Amino acid sequence: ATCADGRTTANAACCVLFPILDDIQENLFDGAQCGEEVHESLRLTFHDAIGFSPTLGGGGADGSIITFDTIETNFPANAGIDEIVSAQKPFVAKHNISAGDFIQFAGAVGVSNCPGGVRIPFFLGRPDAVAASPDHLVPEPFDSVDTILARMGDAGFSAVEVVWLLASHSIAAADKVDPSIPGTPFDSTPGVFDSQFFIETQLKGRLFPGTPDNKGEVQSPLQGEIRLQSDHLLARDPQTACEWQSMVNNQPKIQNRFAGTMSKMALLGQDKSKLIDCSDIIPTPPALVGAAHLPAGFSLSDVEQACAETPFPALTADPGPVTSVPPVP
Ligand code: HEM
Ligand SMILES: [Ca+2]
Ligand SMILES: [Ca+2]
């Protein structure tokens, strides 16, 4: 079909997304960048969609975290979901689509801004949220591996699918894990969608950045990087360790699995055959910047290998001496 300004798309219903793309790129993503706002909106897709259980209830990706912010925003697990929700609300009100659609749309666009990023399939027509999500549906970093895999399993995800989704921590920081150091990223290149997250979580920890005693934090191998307790355990648990390691220096797999599982996540509580494919609206991501590497000063011996069938790949270390990682601006 051909839309108002001559831009085209497969299905005419998708035309409404064009002016919304333009607005959010300029006014939410600070000029189509891969910074905080993108990170924040990516997180939001999860906090929305994961509110779904065949036993416990919840409408999955339905925008209920926005429509029922008052309730959900005040779940312990949704700490710091405030700003994101409050930031997207004017766009939701102003524009032409449901909150469920907007949350996933912005997330997908946001990802497409990150170097090494991938186009996430996007479908239109989620109806307004019916009710709030029930409590206890959002995984926390201090949840054990069994609790995390059970919850994600209950939502519809296998163990390997969890690992694939955690590629999101490649473009991610923390504000509330250690409040003393807001904006501390989970890997060295928070503005690039790459495998550094899967590499650097496998390294032997060295120190606590910021303060030493926080719920859901373990020692990080790098100053200016934070390691979630959960990610640390997932890189090493027999259920997830080998798949985790398989992501290392494997950009095409990372892109493929992330796009596939994100689309599955975005469809939680929904029906693909009852939506319109609006995937061609999603822009083309910039190519990957940089190659897989150990941090400077590090070597293979600093990797705590935990995949029983397959050894950790050979990676070189960055030229020079050990160094920190700036908080996310
Ligand atoms: C599976 C268990 C998971 C746990 C326990 C977990 C935990 C966390 C925690 C504690 C933070 C920091 C929040 C803060 O203190 O500010 C965070 C950030 C983030 N999470 Fe995860 N997460 C999980 C899975 C996921 C998934 C499936 C996605 C999918 C998109 C995701 C996307 C993000 C992003 C993009 C950020 C960065 C937010 C920012 O930098 O502003 N996470 N996560
Ligand atoms: Ca929801
Ligand atoms: Ca990265």
Numbering used by the authors: 2 to 330
Reproduce passages from the article.
The heterologous expression of the POD genes from the P. ostreatus genome, and subsequent kinetic studies, reveal a peroxidase array consisting of three VPs and six MnPs. The overall structure of VP1 and MnP4 showed a heme group dividing the protein into a distal largely helical domain (formed by four main helices and two to three small ones) with one structural calcium ion, and a proximal domain composed by another six helices and a non-ordered region stabilized by a second calcium ion. The site where this takes place is conserved and comprises three acidic residues (E36/E40/D175 in VP1 and E36/E40/D181 in MnP4) located near the heme propionate occupying the most internal position with respect to the main access channel.
As already described for P. eryngii VPL, the main structural feature of the P. ostreatus VP1 crystal structure is the combination of the Mn oxidation site of MnPs and the high redox potential substrate oxidation site of LiPs. In addition to the Mn2+ oxidation site, VPs also present a lignin oxidation site, whose presence was detected using VA and RB5 as substrates. This site in VP1 would consist of W164, connected to the heme group via a long-range electron transfer (LRET). The indolic side chain of W164 in VP1 is largely exposed (center) allowing the collection of electrons from the bulky lignin molecule. In a similar way, the W164S mutation in VP1 resulted in a complete loss of activity on VA and RB5 (used as two simple lignin model compounds). The last change in this region concerns S180 in VP1, which is occupied by K186 in MnP4, thus affecting both the surface shape and charge. The lower lip in VP1 presents a clear negative charge and the shape of a wide reservoir, while in MnP4 it displays a less charged surface with a narrow groove (circles in Figure 5C). However, one of the main characteristics of the VP1 structure, when compared with MnP4, is the broader main heme access channel (whose lower lip has the shape of a wide reservoir), which could be related to the reported existence of a third substrate oxidation site in VP. For example, we tried to correlate the POD thermal stability to the proline number and position in β-turns and to the effect of heme-apoenzyme bonds.
